Amino acid sequence: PPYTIVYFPVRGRAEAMRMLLADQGQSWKEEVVTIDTWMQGLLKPTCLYGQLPKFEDGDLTLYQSNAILRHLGRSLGLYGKNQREAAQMDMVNDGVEDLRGKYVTLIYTNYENGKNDYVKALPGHLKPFETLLSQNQGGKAFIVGDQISFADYNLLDLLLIHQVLAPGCLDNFPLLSAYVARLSARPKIKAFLSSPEHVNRPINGNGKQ
Amino acid sequence: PPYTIVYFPVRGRAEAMRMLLADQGQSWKEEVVTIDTWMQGLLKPTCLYGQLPKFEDGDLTLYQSNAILRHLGRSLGLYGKNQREAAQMDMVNDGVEDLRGKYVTLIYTNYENGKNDYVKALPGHLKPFETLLSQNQGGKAFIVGDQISFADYNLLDLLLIHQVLAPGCLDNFPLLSAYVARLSARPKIKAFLSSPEHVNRPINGNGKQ
Ligand SMILES: N[C@@H](CCC(=O)N[C@@H](CSCc1ccc([N+](=O)[O-])cc1)C(=O)NCC(=O)O)C(=O)O
Ligand SMILES: N[C@@H](CCC(=O)N[C@@H](CSCc1ccc([N+](=O)[O-])cc1)C(=O)NCC(=O)O)C(=O)O
Protein backbone atom coordinates (compact mmCIF):
# COMPACT_ATOMS: atom_id res chain seq x y z
CA PRO A 1 0.00 0.00 0.00
CA PRO A 2 -1.06 2.66 -0.73
CA TYR A 3 -3.15 1.26 -3.57
CA THR A 4 -4.21 3.21 -6.67
CA ILE A 5 -6.40 1.90 -9.52
CA VAL A 6 -6.15 3.52 -12.96
CA TYR A 7 -9.10 2.36 -15.10
CA PHE A 8 -12.07 3.42 -17.27
CA PRO A 9 -15.32 4.51 -15.53
CA VAL A 10 -16.83 0.99 -15.46
CA ARG A 11 -16.81 -2.10 -13.21
CA GLY A 12 -15.38 -4.41 -15.87
CA ARG A 13 -11.98 -5.90 -15.06
CA ALA A 14 -11.49 -3.74 -11.96
CA GLU A 15 -14.53 -4.73 -9.93
CA ALA A 16 -13.17 -8.02 -8.55
CA MET A 17 -9.99 -6.35 -7.24
CA ARG A 18 -12.18 -3.62 -5.76
CA MET A 19 -14.29 -6.15 -3.87
CA LEU A 20 -11.16 -7.90 -2.69
CA LEU A 21 -9.58 -4.70 -1.29
CA ALA A 22 -12.88 -3.69 0.30
CA ASP A 23 -13.49 -7.07 1.89
CA GLN A 24 -10.00 -6.90 3.35
CA GLY A 25 -10.63 -3.47 4.84
CA GLN A 26 -8.13 -1.81 2.52
CA SER A 27 -8.53 1.65 1.02
CA TRP A 28 -7.29 2.88 -2.36
CA LYS A 29 -7.07 5.88 -4.67
CA GLU A 30 -9.32 5.77 -7.72
CA GLU A 31 -7.91 7.31 -10.90
CA VAL A 32 -10.72 7.17 -13.44
CA VAL A 33 -9.85 7.58 -17.13
CA THR A 34 -12.68 8.70 -19.44
CA ILE A 35 -12.85 7.47 -23.04
CA ASP A 36 -12.24 11.07 -24.07
CA THR A 37 -8.97 11.23 -22.14
CA TRP A 38 -8.03 7.77 -23.38
CA MET A 39 -8.45 8.77 -27.03
CA GLN A 40 -6.02 11.66 -26.45
CA GLY A 41 -3.32 9.01 -26.81
CA LEU A 42 -1.07 10.21 -24.00
CA LEU A 43 -1.65 7.51 -21.37
CA LYS A 44 -2.08 4.44 -23.56
CA PRO A 45 1.50 4.51 -24.93
CA THR A 46 2.95 4.62 -21.40
CA CYS A 47 1.00 1.47 -20.56
CA LEU A 48 3.01 -1.79 -20.81
CA TYR A 49 0.47 -3.49 -23.03
CA GLY A 50 -1.37 -0.33 -24.03
CA GLN A 51 -4.30 -1.19 -21.81
CA LEU A 52 -5.97 -0.68 -18.43
CA PRO A 53 -6.40 -1.43 -15.59
CA LYS A 54 -3.08 -0.09 -14.35
CA PHE A 55 -2.23 -0.76 -10.68
CA GLU A 56 0.12 1.11 -8.34
CA ASP A 57 1.20 -0.23 -4.94
CA GLY A 58 3.29 2.88 -4.43
CA ASP A 59 6.63 1.48 -5.53
CA LEU A 60 5.39 -1.27 -7.82
CA THR A 61 3.45 -0.48 -10.97
CA LEU A 62 1.40 -3.33 -12.48
CA TYR A 63 -0.78 -4.18 -15.48
CA GLN A 64 -2.99 -7.16 -16.34
CA SER A 65 -6.07 -7.57 -14.16
CA ASN A 66 -5.40 -11.18 -13.19
CA ALA A 67 -1.76 -10.45 -12.40
CA ILE A 68 -3.05 -7.72 -10.08
CA LEU A 69 -5.55 -10.02 -8.37
CA ARG A 70 -2.83 -12.62 -7.85
CA HIS A 71 -0.48 -10.00 -6.41
CA LEU A 72 -3.16 -8.96 -3.92
CA GLY A 73 -4.07 -12.53 -3.04
CA ARG A 74 -0.41 -13.36 -2.47
CA SER A 75 0.45 -10.23 -0.48
CA LEU A 76 -2.72 -10.42 1.65
CA GLY A 77 -2.97 -14.10 2.59
CA LEU A 78 -5.68 -15.00 0.09
CA TYR A 79 -3.83 -17.60 -1.96
CA GLY A 80 -4.41 -20.90 -0.14
CA LYS A 81 -2.46 -22.62 2.63
CA ASN A 82 -0.15 -24.80 0.51
CA GLN A 83 1.06 -25.32 -3.07
CA ARG A 84 -1.78 -27.67 -3.99
CA GLU A 85 -4.44 -25.11 -3.13
CA ALA A 86 -2.50 -22.41 -4.97
CA ALA A 87 -2.34 -24.51 -8.15
CA GLN A 88 -6.06 -25.18 -7.93
CA MET A 89 -6.99 -21.52 -7.35
CA ASP A 90 -5.05 -20.73 -10.52
CA MET A 91 -6.87 -23.42 -12.48
CA VAL A 92 -10.05 -21.81 -11.19
CA ASN A 93 -9.03 -18.26 -12.07
CA ASP A 94 -7.99 -19.32 -15.57
CA GLY A 95 -11.48 -20.69 -16.13
CA VAL A 96 -13.02 -17.47 -14.79
CA GLU A 97 -10.89 -15.44 -17.21
CA ASP A 98 -11.80 -17.57 -20.24
CA LEU A 99 -15.50 -17.00 -19.63
CA ARG A 100 -14.87 -13.31 -18.89
CA GLY A 101 -13.13 -12.90 -22.24
CA LYS A 102 -16.21 -14.26 -24.02
CA TYR A 103 -18.51 -12.07 -21.95
CA VAL A 104 -16.50 -9.00 -23.05
CA THR A 105 -16.56 -9.90 -26.74
CA LEU A 106 -20.35 -10.35 -26.51
CA ILE A 107 -20.99 -7.16 -24.59
CA TYR A 108 -18.83 -5.00 -26.85
CA THR A 109 -19.01 -6.77 -30.25
CA ASN A 110 -22.24 -8.68 -30.80
CA TYR A 111 -24.71 -8.21 -27.98
CA GLU A 112 -27.84 -8.12 -30.16
CA ASN A 113 -27.13 -11.08 -32.43
CA GLY A 114 -25.06 -13.12 -29.98
CA LYS A 115 -26.76 -12.91 -26.59
CA ASN A 116 -29.36 -15.59 -27.37
CA ASP A 117 -26.64 -18.10 -28.27
CA TYR A 118 -24.46 -17.01 -25.34
CA VAL A 119 -27.04 -17.53 -22.59
CA LYS A 120 -27.86 -20.92 -24.06
CA ALA A 121 -24.20 -21.96 -24.00
CA LEU A 122 -23.72 -20.38 -20.56
CA PRO A 123 -24.87 -23.40 -18.48
CA GLY A 124 -22.15 -25.67 -19.84
CA HIS A 125 -19.70 -22.92 -18.91
CA LEU A 126 -20.97 -22.65 -15.35
CA LYS A 127 -21.12 -26.36 -14.56
CA PRO A 128 -17.34 -26.72 -14.12
CA PHE A 129 -17.61 -24.31 -11.19
CA GLU A 130 -20.61 -26.15 -9.74
CA THR A 131 -18.57 -29.34 -9.99
CA LEU A 132 -15.63 -27.70 -8.18
CA LEU A 133 -17.82 -26.71 -5.25
CA SER A 134 -19.41 -30.15 -4.94
CA GLN A 135 -15.94 -31.66 -4.66
CA ASN A 136 -15.15 -29.20 -1.85
CA GLN A 137 -17.10 -29.76 1.37
CA GLY A 138 -20.37 -30.02 -0.52
CA GLY A 139 -19.88 -26.43 -1.62
CA LYS A 140 -20.20 -24.97 1.87
CA ALA A 141 -16.82 -23.23 2.00
CA PHE A 142 -15.06 -21.49 -0.88
CA ILE A 143 -14.21 -22.39 -4.49
CA VAL A 144 -10.92 -23.85 -3.24
CA GLY A 145 -10.42 -24.62 0.46
CA ASP A 146 -12.08 -22.99 3.46
CA GLN A 147 -10.58 -19.50 3.19
CA ILE A 148 -11.57 -16.65 0.85
CA SER A 149 -9.07 -16.37 -2.04
CA PHE A 150 -8.52 -13.98 -4.93
CA ALA A 151 -10.15 -16.64 -7.09
CA ASP A 152 -13.42 -16.32 -5.15
CA TYR A 153 -13.60 -12.55 -5.69
CA ASN A 154 -13.11 -13.02 -9.46
CA LEU A 155 -15.66 -15.87 -9.66
CA LEU A 156 -18.18 -13.96 -7.51
CA ASP A 157 -17.84 -10.93 -9.71
CA LEU A 158 -18.22 -13.06 -12.84
CA LEU A 159 -21.36 -14.72 -11.53
CA LEU A 160 -22.96 -11.42 -10.45
CA ILE A 161 -22.67 -9.80 -13.88
CA HIS A 162 -23.98 -12.99 -15.47
CA GLN A 163 -27.07 -12.96 -13.23
CA VAL A 164 -27.70 -9.50 -14.67
CA LEU A 165 -27.15 -10.71 -18.23
CA ALA A 166 -29.38 -13.75 -17.67
CA PRO A 167 -31.49 -13.62 -14.45
CA GLY A 168 -31.87 -17.37 -14.02
CA CYS A 169 -28.46 -18.69 -15.02
CA LEU A 170 -27.81 -20.17 -11.56
CA ASP A 171 -31.23 -21.76 -11.00
CA ASN A 172 -29.89 -25.18 -11.97
CA PHE A 173 -26.74 -24.64 -9.95
CA PRO A 174 -27.67 -24.94 -6.24
CA LEU A 175 -24.12 -24.75 -4.91
CA LEU A 176 -23.25 -21.71 -7.04
CA SER A 177 -26.53 -19.99 -6.11
CA ALA A 178 -26.01 -20.31 -2.38
CA TYR A 179 -22.30 -19.62 -2.89
CA VAL A 180 -23.22 -16.30 -4.47
CA ALA A 181 -25.81 -15.36 -1.88
CA ARG A 182 -23.39 -16.25 0.91
CA LEU A 183 -20.29 -14.35 -0.18
CA SER A 184 -22.49 -11.35 -0.95
CA ALA A 185 -23.79 -11.50 2.63
CA ARG A 186 -20.26 -10.93 3.97
CA PRO A 187 -20.40 -7.57 5.85
CA LYS A 188 -17.87 -5.51 3.90
CA ILE A 189 -18.93 -7.19 0.64
CA LYS A 190 -22.65 -6.50 1.09
CA ALA A 191 -21.67 -2.95 2.05
CA PHE A 192 -19.47 -2.65 -1.05
CA LEU A 193 -22.29 -3.92 -3.26
CA SER A 194 -24.49 -1.09 -1.98
CA SER A 195 -21.98 1.79 -1.97
CA PRO A 196 -22.56 4.69 -4.43
CA GLU A 197 -19.11 4.24 -5.93
CA HIS A 198 -20.15 0.75 -7.06
CA VAL A 199 -23.86 1.28 -7.58
CA ASN A 200 -23.40 4.36 -9.83
CA ARG A 201 -20.60 2.73 -11.82
CA PRO A 202 -21.87 1.02 -15.01
CA ILE A 203 -20.90 -2.65 -15.41
CA ASN A 204 -19.49 -2.05 -18.87
CA GLY A 205 -18.46 0.97 -20.93
CA ASN A 206 -21.15 0.72 -23.64
CA GLY A 207 -24.29 0.74 -21.49
CA LYS A 208 -24.90 -2.96 -22.05
CA GLN A 209 -25.24 -5.58 -19.34
CA PRO B 1 5.86 -36.39 -9.23
CA PRO B 2 5.54 -38.39 -11.36
CA TYR B 3 4.61 -36.00 -14.22
CA THR B 4 2.10 -36.85 -16.96
CA ILE B 5 1.05 -34.69 -19.91
CA VAL B 6 -2.30 -35.44 -21.56
CA TYR B 7 -2.64 -33.53 -24.83
CA PHE B 8 -3.25 -33.73 -28.58
CA PRO B 9 -0.32 -34.73 -30.88
CA VAL B 10 0.89 -31.11 -31.20
CA ARG B 11 3.21 -28.68 -29.40
CA GLY B 12 0.67 -25.91 -28.92
CA ARG B 13 -0.06 -25.18 -25.25
CA ALA B 14 2.07 -28.08 -23.96
CA GLU B 15 5.46 -27.25 -25.50
CA ALA B 16 6.33 -24.55 -22.96
CA MET B 17 5.79 -26.84 -19.95
CA ARG B 18 7.69 -29.62 -21.72
CA MET B 19 10.62 -27.28 -22.37
CA LEU B 20 10.40 -26.14 -18.77
CA LEU B 21 10.50 -29.72 -17.44
CA ALA B 22 13.34 -30.51 -19.84
CA ASP B 23 15.56 -27.57 -18.79
CA GLN B 24 15.10 -28.70 -15.19
CA GLY B 25 16.37 -32.19 -15.95
CA GLN B 26 12.91 -33.62 -15.26
CA SER B 27 11.33 -36.49 -17.19
CA TRP B 28 7.64 -37.16 -17.78
CA LYS B 29 5.02 -39.40 -19.40
CA GLU B 30 3.04 -38.42 -22.49
CA GLU B 31 -0.49 -39.68 -23.05
CA VAL B 32 -1.22 -38.69 -26.63
CA VAL B 33 -4.91 -38.17 -27.34
CA THR B 34 -5.72 -38.35 -31.06
CA ILE B 35 -8.46 -36.36 -32.81
CA ASP B 36 -10.40 -39.54 -33.56
CA THR B 37 -10.33 -40.56 -29.87
CA TRP B 38 -11.36 -37.06 -28.81
CA MET B 39 -14.29 -37.09 -31.24
CA GLN B 40 -15.60 -40.20 -29.52
CA GLY B 41 -16.42 -37.87 -26.63
CA LEU B 42 -15.43 -40.16 -23.77
CA LEU B 43 -12.56 -38.11 -22.37
CA LYS B 44 -13.79 -34.55 -23.05
CA PRO B 45 -16.60 -34.73 -20.42
CA THR B 46 -14.14 -35.90 -17.75
CA CYS B 47 -12.05 -32.73 -18.26
CA LEU B 48 -12.93 -29.89 -15.86
CA TYR B 49 -13.31 -27.39 -18.71
CA GLY B 50 -13.80 -29.93 -21.50
CA GLN B 51 -10.31 -29.19 -22.83
CA LEU B 52 -6.64 -30.25 -22.84
CA PRO B 53 -3.86 -30.08 -21.82
CA LYS B 54 -4.38 -32.10 -18.65
CA PHE B 55 -1.50 -32.36 -16.17
CA GLU B 56 -0.83 -34.96 -13.51
CA ASP B 57 1.63 -34.28 -10.71
CA GLY B 58 1.31 -37.24 -8.35
CA ASP B 59 -2.23 -37.29 -6.90
CA LEU B 60 -2.79 -33.72 -8.17
CA THR B 61 -4.58 -33.31 -11.47
CA LEU B 62 -4.58 -29.98 -13.27
CA TYR B 63 -6.15 -28.27 -16.27
CA GLN B 64 -5.39 -24.90 -17.91
CA SER B 65 -1.92 -24.47 -19.41
CA ASN B 66 -0.98 -21.35 -17.44
CA ALA B 67 -2.15 -22.88 -14.18
CA ILE B 68 0.09 -25.86 -14.97
CA LEU B 69 3.04 -23.60 -15.79
CA ARG B 70 2.53 -21.70 -12.50
CA HIS B 71 2.35 -24.89 -10.50
CA LEU B 72 5.69 -26.04 -11.95
CA GLY B 73 7.31 -22.66 -11.32
CA ARG B 74 6.20 -22.61 -7.71
CA SER B 75 7.14 -26.23 -6.99
CA LEU B 76 10.43 -26.12 -8.92
CA GLY B 77 11.59 -22.69 -7.79
CA LEU B 78 10.92 -20.84 -11.05
CA TYR B 79 8.70 -18.13 -9.56
CA GLY B 80 11.12 -15.41 -8.49
CA LYS B 81 12.84 -14.60 -5.20
CA ASN B 82 9.95 -12.62 -3.65
CA GLN B 83 6.43 -11.18 -4.03
CA ARG B 84 7.52 -8.24 -6.18
CA GLU B 85 9.12 -10.57 -8.76
CA ALA B 86 6.21 -13.01 -8.58
CA ALA B 87 3.75 -10.24 -9.45
CA GLN B 88 6.06 -9.03 -12.24
CA MET B 89 6.29 -12.55 -13.64
CA ASP B 90 2.51 -12.95 -13.69
CA MET B 91 2.29 -9.62 -15.51
CA VAL B 92 4.66 -11.01 -18.15
CA ASN B 93 2.97 -14.39 -18.46
CA ASP B 94 -0.44 -12.80 -18.84
CA GLY B 95 0.97 -10.65 -21.63
CA VAL B 96 2.41 -13.76 -23.25
CA GLU B 97 -1.03 -15.43 -22.92
CA ASP B 98 -2.85 -12.52 -24.61
CA LEU B 99 -0.59 -12.70 -27.67
CA ARG B 100 -0.77 -16.49 -27.70
CA GLY B 101 -4.55 -16.24 -27.75
CA LYS B 102 -4.36 -14.00 -30.80
CA TYR B 103 -1.83 -16.33 -32.41
CA VAL B 104 -4.13 -19.30 -32.07
CA THR B 105 -7.05 -17.32 -33.50
CA LEU B 106 -5.01 -16.48 -36.58
CA ILE B 107 -3.75 -20.04 -37.08
CA TYR B 108 -7.10 -21.81 -36.64
CA THR B 109 -9.72 -19.39 -37.89
CA ASN B 110 -8.25 -16.82 -40.27
CA TYR B 111 -4.76 -17.74 -41.42
CA GLU B 112 -4.88 -16.76 -45.10
CA ASN B 113 -6.89 -13.56 -44.79
CA GLY B 114 -5.49 -12.25 -41.50
CA LYS B 115 -1.79 -13.07 -41.48
CA ASN B 116 -0.73 -9.87 -43.23
CA ASP B 117 -2.66 -7.79 -40.69
CA TYR B 118 -1.28 -9.88 -37.81
CA VAL B 119 2.37 -9.60 -38.85
CA LYS B 120 1.90 -5.88 -39.47
CA ALA B 121 0.55 -5.46 -35.94
CA LEU B 122 3.02 -7.88 -34.33
CA PRO B 123 5.80 -5.31 -33.64
CA GLY B 124 3.38 -3.46 -31.39
CA HIS B 125 2.80 -6.70 -29.47
CA LEU B 126 6.47 -7.54 -29.10
CA LYS B 127 7.59 -4.08 -27.98
CA PRO B 128 6.38 -4.62 -24.37
CA PHE B 129 8.71 -7.57 -23.91
CA GLU B 130 11.67 -5.76 -25.47
CA THR B 131 10.91 -2.92 -23.02
CA LEU B 132 10.69 -5.33 -20.07
CA LEU B 133 14.13 -6.76 -20.87
CA SER B 134 15.74 -3.33 -21.24
CA GLN B 135 14.54 -2.47 -17.73
CA ASN B 136 16.04 -5.64 -16.25
CA GLN B 137 19.85 -5.53 -16.14
CA GLY B 138 19.81 -3.97 -19.60
CA GLY B 139 18.34 -7.20 -20.96
CA LYS B 140 21.29 -9.53 -20.39
CA ALA B 141 19.48 -11.83 -17.99
CA PHE B 142 15.88 -13.05 -18.10
CA ILE B 143 12.42 -11.53 -18.44
CA VAL B 144 12.23 -10.89 -14.66
CA GLY B 145 15.06 -11.10 -12.11
CA ASP B 146 18.39 -12.93 -12.49
CA GLN B 147 16.86 -16.43 -12.43
CA ILE B 148 14.88 -18.26 -15.09
CA SER B 149 11.15 -18.52 -14.30
CA PHE B 150 8.10 -20.19 -15.79
CA ALA B 151 7.38 -16.90 -17.59
CA ASP B 152 10.61 -17.20 -19.60
CA TYR B 153 9.72 -20.64 -20.94
CA ASN B 154 6.29 -19.43 -22.09
CA LEU B 155 7.71 -16.26 -23.69
CA LEU B 156 10.59 -18.15 -25.31
CA ASP B 157 8.16 -20.68 -26.82
CA LEU B 158 5.86 -17.95 -28.09
CA LEU B 159 8.80 -16.05 -29.61
CA LEU B 160 10.13 -19.17 -31.37
CA ILE B 161 6.81 -20.01 -33.02
CA HIS B 162 6.41 -16.37 -34.12
CA GLN B 163 9.78 -16.54 -35.90
CA VAL B 164 8.41 -19.46 -37.90
CA LEU B 165 5.28 -17.45 -38.65
CA ALA B 166 7.22 -14.28 -39.50
CA PRO B 167 10.95 -14.89 -40.18
CA GLY B 168 12.95 -11.95 -38.86
CA CYS B 169 10.18 -10.49 -36.69
CA LEU B 170 12.85 -9.99 -34.06
CA ASP B 171 15.22 -8.10 -36.38
CA ASN B 172 14.08 -4.79 -34.90
CA PHE B 173 14.25 -6.13 -31.33
CA PRO B 174 17.92 -6.65 -30.32
CA LEU B 175 17.16 -7.62 -26.73
CA LEU B 176 14.45 -10.15 -27.71
CA SER B 177 16.68 -11.64 -30.45
CA ALA B 178 19.71 -12.07 -28.21
CA TYR B 179 17.35 -13.29 -25.49
CA VAL B 180 16.02 -16.12 -27.66
CA ALA B 181 19.47 -17.18 -28.87
CA ARG B 182 20.77 -17.03 -25.27
CA LEU B 183 18.00 -19.19 -23.79
CA SER B 184 17.88 -21.52 -26.82
CA ALA B 185 21.62 -22.02 -26.22
CA ARG B 186 21.06 -23.48 -22.75
CA PRO B 187 22.31 -27.10 -23.07
CA LYS B 188 19.07 -28.73 -21.89
CA ILE B 189 16.89 -26.45 -24.08
CA LYS B 190 19.31 -26.82 -26.99
CA ALA B 191 18.83 -30.60 -26.68
CA PHE B 192 15.05 -30.40 -26.27
CA LEU B 193 14.62 -28.11 -29.27
CA SER B 194 16.40 -30.72 -31.36
CA SER B 195 14.96 -33.79 -29.67
CA PRO B 196 13.02 -36.13 -31.96
CA GLU B 197 9.80 -35.92 -29.89
CA HIS B 198 9.75 -32.12 -30.23
CA VAL B 199 10.80 -32.11 -33.87
CA ASN B 200 8.28 -34.81 -34.89
CA ARG B 201 5.49 -32.80 -33.27
CA PRO B 202 3.79 -30.20 -35.45
CA ILE B 203 3.43 -26.69 -34.01
CA ASN B 204 -0.35 -26.72 -34.40
CA GLY B 205 -3.28 -29.08 -35.10
CA ASN B 206 -3.91 -27.98 -38.72
CA GLY B 207 -0.31 -27.89 -39.90
CA LYS B 208 -0.25 -24.12 -40.46
CA GLN B 209 2.64 -22.16 -38.95
N1 LIG C 1 -5.59 -8.81 -20.26
C1 LIG C 1 -5.82 -7.43 -20.03
C2 LIG C 1 -7.00 -6.96 -20.88
C3 LIG C 1 -7.22 -5.45 -20.68
C4 LIG C 1 -8.34 -4.83 -21.50
O1 LIG C 1 -9.07 -5.46 -22.28
N2 LIG C 1 -8.39 -3.52 -21.26
C5 LIG C 1 -9.32 -2.60 -21.92
C6 LIG C 1 -10.33 -2.04 -20.94
S1 LIG C 1 -11.39 -3.31 -20.16
C7 LIG C 1 -12.80 -3.20 -21.32
C8 LIG C 1 -13.34 -1.78 -21.44
C9 LIG C 1 -13.35 -1.09 -22.68
C10 LIG C 1 -13.83 0.24 -22.73
C11 LIG C 1 -14.32 0.87 -21.55
N3 LIG C 1 -14.83 2.28 -21.59
O2 LIG C 1 -15.25 2.84 -20.58
O3 LIG C 1 -14.84 2.89 -22.63
C12 LIG C 1 -14.31 0.17 -20.33
C13 LIG C 1 -13.83 -1.15 -20.27
C14 LIG C 1 -8.54 -1.46 -22.54
O4 LIG C 1 -7.57 -1.01 -21.89
N4 LIG C 1 -8.92 -0.97 -23.75
C15 LIG C 1 -8.20 0.15 -24.36
C16 LIG C 1 -7.43 -0.19 -25.62
O5 LIG C 1 -7.17 -1.39 -25.88
O6 LIG C 1 -7.08 0.76 -26.34
C17 LIG C 1 -6.17 -7.51 -18.52
O7 LIG C 1 -6.63 -8.54 -18.02
O8 LIG C 1 -5.95 -6.53 -17.82
N1 LIG D 1 -7.26 -21.77 -21.62
C1 LIG D 1 -7.15 -23.14 -21.98
C2 LIG D 1 -7.36 -23.30 -23.47
C3 LIG D 1 -7.32 -24.78 -23.88
C4 LIG D 1 -7.55 -25.06 -25.37
O1 LIG D 1 -7.75 -24.17 -26.19
N2 LIG D 1 -7.53 -26.40 -25.60
C5 LIG D 1 -7.76 -27.05 -26.91
C6 LIG D 1 -6.47 -27.66 -27.43
S1 LIG D 1 -5.13 -26.46 -27.70
C7 LIG D 1 -5.55 -26.04 -29.43
C8 LIG D 1 -5.61 -27.28 -30.32
C9 LIG D 1 -6.79 -27.61 -31.04
C10 LIG D 1 -6.81 -28.77 -31.85
C11 LIG D 1 -5.64 -29.61 -31.95
N3 LIG D 1 -5.64 -30.86 -32.79
O2 LIG D 1 -4.65 -31.58 -32.87
O3 LIG D 1 -6.64 -31.16 -33.41
C12 LIG D 1 -4.47 -29.26 -31.21
C13 LIG D 1 -4.45 -28.10 -30.42
C14 LIG D 1 -8.80 -28.17 -26.80
O4 LIG D 1 -8.76 -28.89 -25.78
N4 LIG D 1 -9.68 -28.33 -27.81
C15 LIG D 1 -10.69 -29.41 -27.77
C16 LIG D 1 -12.08 -28.91 -27.44
O5 LIG D 1 -12.23 -27.75 -27.04
O6 LIG D 1 -13.02 -29.70 -27.57
C17 LIG D 1 -5.68 -23.38 -21.56
O7 LIG D 1 -4.91 -22.41 -21.44
O8 LIG D 1 -5.29 -24.55 -21.35
PDB file of C-alpha atoms in Angstrom, chain B residues 92 129-130 133 139-144 148-157 159 170 173-186:
ATOM      1  CA  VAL B  92       4.658 -11.013 -18.147  1.00  0.00           C
ATOM      2  CA  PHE B 129       8.712  -7.574 -23.911  1.00  0.00           C
ATOM      3  CA  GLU B 130      11.669  -5.761 -25.470  1.00  0.00           C
ATOM      4  CA  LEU B 133      14.131  -6.755 -20.873  1.00  0.00           C
ATOM      5  CA  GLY B 139      18.340  -7.196 -20.963  1.00  0.00           C
ATOM      6  CA  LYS B 140      21.294  -9.527 -20.391  1.00  0.00           C
ATOM      7  CA  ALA B 141      19.477 -11.829 -17.993  1.00  0.00           C
ATOM      8  CA  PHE B 142      15.884 -13.053 -18.103  1.00  0.00           C
ATOM      9  CA  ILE B 143      12.421 -11.531 -18.443  1.00  0.00           C
ATOM     10  CA  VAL B 144      12.235 -10.892 -14.659  1.00  0.00           C
ATOM     11  CA  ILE B 148      14.878 -18.258 -15.093  1.00  0.00           C
ATOM     12  CA  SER B 149      11.154 -18.516 -14.299  1.00  0.00           C
ATOM     13  CA  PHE B 150       8.101 -20.194 -15.790  1.00  0.00           C
ATOM     14  CA  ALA B 151       7.378 -16.902 -17.586  1.00  0.00           C
ATOM     15  CA  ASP B 152      10.615 -17.196 -19.597  1.00  0.00           C
ATOM     16  CA  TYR B 153       9.724 -20.640 -20.936  1.00  0.00           C
ATOM     17  CA  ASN B 154       6.288 -19.432 -22.090  1.00  0.00           C
ATOM     18  CA  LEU B 155       7.706 -16.259 -23.690  1.00  0.00           C
ATOM     19  CA  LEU B 156      10.592 -18.151 -25.309  1.00  0.00           C
ATOM     20  CA  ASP B 157       8.162 -20.680 -26.824  1.00  0.00           C
ATOM     21  CA  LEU B 159       8.799 -16.052 -29.607  1.00  0.00           C
ATOM     22  CA  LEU B 170      12.846  -9.986 -34.055  1.00  0.00           C
ATOM     23  CA  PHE B 173      14.248  -6.128 -31.334  1.00  0.00           C
ATOM     24  CA  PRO B 174      17.919  -6.647 -30.315  1.00  0.00           C
ATOM     25  CA  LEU B 175      17.163  -7.624 -26.727  1.00  0.00           C
ATOM     26  CA  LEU B 176      14.447 -10.148 -27.710  1.00  0.00           C
ATOM     27  CA  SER B 177      16.681 -11.642 -30.449  1.00  0.00           C
ATOM     28  CA  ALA B 178      19.708 -12.073 -28.207  1.00  0.00           C
ATOM     29  CA  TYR B 179      17.350 -13.288 -25.491  1.00  0.00           C
ATOM     30  CA  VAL B 180      16.021 -16.120 -27.656  1.00  0.00           C
ATOM     31  CA  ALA B 181      19.467 -17.183 -28.868  1.00  0.00           C
ATOM     32  CA  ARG B 182      20.769 -17.033 -25.271  1.00  0.00           C
ATOM     33  CA  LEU B 183      17.995 -19.189 -23.795  1.00  0.00           C
ATOM     34  CA  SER B 184      17.879 -21.518 -26.817  1.00  0.00           C
ATOM     35  CA  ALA B 185      21.619 -22.018 -26.218  1.00  0.00           C
ATOM     36  CA  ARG B 186      21.063 -23.477 -22.750  1.00  0.00           C
TER      37      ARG B 186
END
